[PDB]
């Protein structure tokens, strides 16, 4: 299947409560595999998945040294952001960054990413060409000028097309029993009377990996999107995910409704119904 690697950086100021906390987390698809936290007793890049534990001490030293440098860089960036938005030193603010690469089924690069947000709003993004930028506001335009002058996009392009892809392929091979295994959803329909007049049909998908899934209801073959309650996909705690979709149906009309499931762990899309 297709696969992605992402690194996520977050820097959170907290005036009066020390220096801003800096965290880094790395993911392959929906599997976290490394974490750094400046609030840890001894900050290190640390393993979070068994297949990364075999990287040698030089790997962990480099990831740690870069993350400690980034702690300082992003604390400086938070000070710069106050100046860019005319904000005082009294409030708490957050910078977030994501970057990484997406591979297709053949293991070739589909596209790369590098984007930032400030206080939860988009700030700047590398365009899909990996050569130009989109700035969200006049503050980000200032950063864009700096990054054009410093040829930042060229450095990100070389990383995203090169090292990012090469390390992701290595991780995929070392974790091939899990990273390269899709677990299909276990599906079933439950029935919950509301009144004498109506009942809820709830279509469950359980135990699936990765998280991406499509779960819908039809009545007489017509999509019921606007009448379906669809919860956010949610982690079970065992690496897998859960989701359900529910419709309210008149008593005795249950066989007019069908639940439809698509997941990459399934050879073909599934249709199911309430089975009394």
């Amino acid at each position: 299947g297709s696969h992605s690697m992402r690194y996520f950086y977050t820097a959170m100021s907290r005036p009066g409560r020390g220096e801003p906390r800096f965290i880094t987390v790395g993911y392959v698809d929906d599997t976290q595999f490394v974490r750094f936290d400046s609030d840890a007793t001894s900050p290190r890049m640390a393993p979070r998945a068994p297949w990364i534990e075999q990287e040698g001490p030089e790997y962990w030293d480099r990831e740690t040294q870069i993350s400690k440098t980034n702690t300082q860089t992003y604390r400086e960036n938070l000070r710069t952001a106050l100046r860019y938005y005319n904000q005082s030193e009294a409030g708490s603010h957050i910078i977030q960054r994501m970057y990484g690469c997406d591979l297709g089924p053949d293991g070739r690069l589909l596209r790369g990413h590098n984007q930032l947000a400030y206080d939860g709003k988009d700030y700047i993004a590398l365009n899909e060409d990996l050569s130009s930028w989109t700035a969200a506001d006049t503050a980000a335009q200032i950063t864009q000028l700096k990054w054009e002058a410093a040829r930042v996009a060229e450095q990100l392009r070389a990383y995203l097309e090169g090292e990012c892809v090469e390390w992701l392929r290595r991780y995929l091979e070392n974790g091939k029993e899990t990273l390269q295994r899709a677990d299909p959803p276990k599906t079933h329909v439950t029935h919950h009377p509301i009144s004498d007049h109506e009942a809820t049909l709830r279509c469950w998908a359980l135990g699936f990996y990765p998280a991406e899934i499509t779960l819908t209801w039809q009545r007489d073959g017509e999509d019921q999107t606007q009448d379906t309650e669809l919860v956010e996909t949610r982690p079970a705690g065992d690496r897998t995910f859960q989701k359900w979709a529910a419709v309210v149906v008149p008593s005795g009309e249950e066989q007019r409704y069908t639940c439809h499931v698509q997941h990459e762990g399934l050879p073909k899309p599934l249709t199911l119904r309430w089975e009394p």
Binding site: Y59, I66, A81, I95, I142, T143, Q155, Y159
Partner: peptide, 10 residues
């Protein structure tokens, strides 16, 4: 493996 940024100052 993380990127070693040459320039990432806002």
């Amino acid at each position: 493996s993380v990127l070693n940024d040459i320039f990432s100052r806002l």
